[PDB]
Write a protein that binds this DNA or RNA. Sequence first.
RNA 1: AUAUUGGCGAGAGACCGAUAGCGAACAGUACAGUGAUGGAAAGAUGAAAAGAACUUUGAAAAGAGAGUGAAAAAGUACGUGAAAUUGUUGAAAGGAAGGGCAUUUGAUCAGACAUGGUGUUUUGUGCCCUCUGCUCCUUGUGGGUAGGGGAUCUCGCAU
RNA 2: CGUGGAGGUCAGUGACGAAGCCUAGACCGUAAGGUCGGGUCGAACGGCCUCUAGUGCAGAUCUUGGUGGUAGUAGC
Lengths: 123, 127, 173, 385, 267, 125
Amino acid sequence: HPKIVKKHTKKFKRHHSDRYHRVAENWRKQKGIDSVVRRRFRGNISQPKIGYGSNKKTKFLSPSGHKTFLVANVKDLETLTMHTKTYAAEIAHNISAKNRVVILARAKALGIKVTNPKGRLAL
Amino acid sequence: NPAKSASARGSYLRVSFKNTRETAQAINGWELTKAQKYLEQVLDHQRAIPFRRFNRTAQGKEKARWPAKSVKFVQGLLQNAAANAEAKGLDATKLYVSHIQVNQAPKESSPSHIELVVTEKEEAVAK
Amino acid sequence: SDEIVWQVINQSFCSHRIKAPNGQNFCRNEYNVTGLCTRQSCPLANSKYATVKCDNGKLYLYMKTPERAHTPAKLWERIKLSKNYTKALQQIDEHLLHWSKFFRHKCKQRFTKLTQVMITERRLALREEERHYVGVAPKVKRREQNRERKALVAAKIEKAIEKELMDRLKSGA
Amino acid sequence: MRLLVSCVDSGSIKEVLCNIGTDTSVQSALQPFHVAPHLAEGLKAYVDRMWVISEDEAILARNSGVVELVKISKHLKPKFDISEFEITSSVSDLFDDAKLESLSSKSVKRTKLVDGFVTLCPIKSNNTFVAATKSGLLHIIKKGEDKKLIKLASLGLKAPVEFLQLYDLEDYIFAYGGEENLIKLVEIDSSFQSLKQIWEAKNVKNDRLDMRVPVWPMALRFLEPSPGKTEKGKLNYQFAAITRWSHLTKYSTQHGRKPFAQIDLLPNREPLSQMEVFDAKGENVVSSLGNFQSETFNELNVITTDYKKNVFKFDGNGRMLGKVGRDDITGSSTYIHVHDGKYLLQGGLDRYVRIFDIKTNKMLVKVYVGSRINFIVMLDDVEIE
Amino acid sequence: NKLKRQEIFADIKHEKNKERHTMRRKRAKEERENPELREQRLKENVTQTIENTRVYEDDLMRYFNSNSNEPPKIFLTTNVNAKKSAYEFANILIEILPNVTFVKRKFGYKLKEISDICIKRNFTDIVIINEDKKKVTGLTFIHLPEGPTFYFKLSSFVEHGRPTSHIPELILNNFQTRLGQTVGRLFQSILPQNPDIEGRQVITLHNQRDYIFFRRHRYVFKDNERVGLQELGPQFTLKLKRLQRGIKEETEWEHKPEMDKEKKKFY
Amino acid sequence: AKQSLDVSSDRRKARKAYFTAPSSQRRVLLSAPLSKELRAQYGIKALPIRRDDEVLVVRGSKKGQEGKISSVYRLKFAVQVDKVTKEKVNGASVPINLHPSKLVITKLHLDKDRKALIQRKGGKL
RNA sequence: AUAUUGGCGAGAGACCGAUAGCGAACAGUACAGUGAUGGAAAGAUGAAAAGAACUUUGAAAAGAGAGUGAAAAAGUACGUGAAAUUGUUGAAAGGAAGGGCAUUUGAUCAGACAUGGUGUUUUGUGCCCUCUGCUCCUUGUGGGUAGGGGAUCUCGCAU
RNA sequence: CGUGGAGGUCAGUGACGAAGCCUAGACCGUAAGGUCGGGUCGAACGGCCUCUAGUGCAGAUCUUGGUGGUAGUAGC
């Protein structure tokens, strides 16, 4: 597949997200006109913009080359039979370990890659 | 290792938090008998408890004070720990205060919780 | 009609659609060759359809025609696929004679994928995997962790070892 | 009541004398009157099979390849009595481990497969008994006028042999089988000097994965001949068997060689064995040997034990009726046998002798014997005053 | 009312503590003059610890365990797709087990095949460590003849002295129960059976309720008829499991999660 | 579904009524089903329980236990069964509180009022 | 026929959820004002108290053992326990710190129970060959299911 | 993008552990955020098309509640 070129691997952080504890790390655009970040002066944190857009041919593809697809039960898992190479089955965090083994068995039978196998399981 | 250590805790005491912390720091890591002797001497004003954080005499060479009120509770807790170790059948000579901590208690005066742990030193080892 | 049904299922909440994070609308319907809810692929949006499904080890070529739309109880007919791969492909091609190339290609791909899914038999034949997946409940984990610590504290292994050594060498040297 | 327990570890017969409600696990609970070993030979020559000819004379078989006739005597010792055992005659050298050793390869998993007595029951009034072994050797032993055992013939069956069951329902025919060995019906000549293979079972069609269904019948029990239509060429026999792979198979010779129905008793083909016919209400609907006195499978109810801990109850359609000793059996039940239709003898690796009530599954007796249990027989159900 | 409930019980506890302290002081003071009364009171008051409230063959040993007449060769391997932690644990296994041979898992030789090969090589026991994450979680031991085996869960694995080349002395504790002494016999037949007391090396197994603690120490005696000991490195605790009684057939005691409710009987 | 306009299906109102129900209503609340053997005898499904009534335990850790009842704790909505008691660390025995809905009556206590109630409820004796 | 924020008694809400909702879910109570008046804070233990028997250090606070309990990481300060803040262990660094571009070092985390696919050669099987049947529609380029005979057999499977 | 509630659908998820919280763990997106790996927790919550609003905080000498330097200082 085409190379997965990540234009910006570093997570964007809100200005002063570390100077004050009351400011969440979630990005928020500065509204003040005098704000240096809004004017993107040299040396300031990078501002998200249209330039960092990832290419469609590699968008949403994990480093393993398989797209993530949440799976809730065997019925959902069976839908990836025709897209095993392009899609991978991801078990939801709320799935009890009782059904996790059954889901993993079906995934192995169909050859569907599992993004987070063995979760909550013990050998 | 619980099999080689004993614990003693005092909660909701009315001693000053800063003085209690200074006393605990001045006594952390000392031997049980040596720590008790040092506290007794402090009660006699022969030695002073250094105040390194919450604050000039010759006794401070080893900026010091004699917090008798806090020292009384500290020595009481040390005696309780020694009694616990004796109940556990530990060697009092090898006992040394390996952990001591002061925590601010609910509010007025500033009460605090004091807990300490004593552990037996490892010795008598040979091929 | 198909156009009205197609547009209603597309823009009016088809019940069996799944939205992946990538932005692809999936289709978990059992009667579809492809799990994508696009046109000419969803069985509900097309009067004529063909698909491969299996209940027992045998594989069956499922197809429907407007002759049975009015009677859903007899909507889909099936024929044994002659599980010999070379014979099965030609049988599928003959059955789908004059059908849209899309349907023939999708049916052949589905049949090939289902046939190669027999790897389950290979793993079943190569059984005796001793890992024996086991699930650990949070309540079970709590019991072992705390009770093991309590047992260790109460055991006093050092004292027992000392007592045994003293009792052993009293008349053992 | 009085029971005889076979102890593999000690290789001795243990006489258990206790009343209903005995429990050795509780000090305050009723305790057995007497529990002592008899005829100890060690784990090398432990008893393998036991049959009670009468309350005074019994015949025992050992894994060493020797069948010993045991004389039972009584002496008094509150006011109850205990029994003593004396061996009068025996026959040895019946085992042939070479056949089993040659079949060790390609087996699922096991050791050299030392031979052992699979079945021991009278052939017929005539004091004639048939001895079967895993090696396939079928020996005939008769009690002479002098009470000394004499060997009359040494027949040979297709090894490996896991079970043997005679057809006592007259209304000599017996069936046998083993690992990768389809069930075969055998007719014995009146002189016991020959055997005829009249009928052989056939495997069922392959599963979804097209894999051949393995054949491993662990036990078999005969039913009455099928009524109504009786086509010639085919035979008239009805029986059911339980396989290791948890498949409950019912056979009807009139229908054909292949079983007419197969039901999966447990998922993942759980190891199952010890198929004993029992009545849901405790009626003695089983013949002297254990065959079901009925001509229909709907009334058939069977008790089977898995190899981990459980004792399962199944009907004629494979439906699980419940469990016996679910909260008390901590190990595999090596031996289970319905006695008088109401008492269920239980024993295994847990070293506890248990007697369960078929009517209610209640644990009636619990006696600790220390050694592992492989065979249990009850002599009398009378309660000591 | 929360305030009323909190205030009422807060004062009640203070009064209860005051009464308890006063009663204890008076009892001690009066017992000082009457020592026998203290003894009678102690006899009349049992601490009711959990231990005190517990709720109630030579041929076998030789046949299902190793004996001094022939040293036991123990086959050591690891579950397929093993990693560094497994080999690190195998290093300690080599350091502690008498005669070990390490063989990489071939991924396809069935357990029957492994047993047959070991019989061909006259091996005595098979030990295999299994891992899920980068940590040891369970250990197994199987005897070749007649296939008596035990499976053990592994927890609290911790890596201070350097053991000498001497064979540590074997000591077992709290194996009175019939099931317990079977694991005790397994340990006595799997670990070295020839002590070399010179060098003061000891290996101890100590079960309390269901977990067995394995540790090594150096022991030195003094004139006070007491022996001091020092930790000799690794900490180890194990839990018996599945009690197969065969290679994989006829399990006898396999543990179930439904147990442990009784809080006693310390299987 | 409820059709009467005089009955409300409000959860809050029902919860308030249940907790604030008087002892007279709680007597009806604390009903216990009769054993299948007794149901055929008296031809009745359930009747209010009382002291001398003998009941069997069908649920809880004490399943399979039986004994004569000794008290009907209407305030706590619980009833006590003789020989079904807890063992404290100090040795004191405290009866375990059980709900009548989880117990089966094995032997009723017969009085004139109980006999009249049995006839009223379509039973027989 | 019309109004109805008071009274009694009922049926409901696309309403709010202990800093909301009436000020009051446990109050017009405590409390302040000579007074008319103002006017709060506060819900949840645990299935059940089974509320820590008992030993042991403390004039007293409560501690250490011990046990009850699914859990005490639920102990009447009790459904769950984050920040601001405070004390200890460890790492780092030193009239300041904070953020951005690129990287070394230290610590540390992931890193396939993947073990395959293809053509060939023995042997045993079936849905495979042959004979004899039963069963559903409609009628059709079908489906389901039985009893006798073998390895012409790679049509699939297992070796 | 996200939240309170409602109509519909997933014969959805869940005591073999739902929500919340923590996490020098990882994945996805330009981001509002979603998802998964590990610890406490216990009983409800969510994938999607619409409707609905007391729907999103960095300050308003902002309100309630909580905690620091000042300070063991002035002082008693």
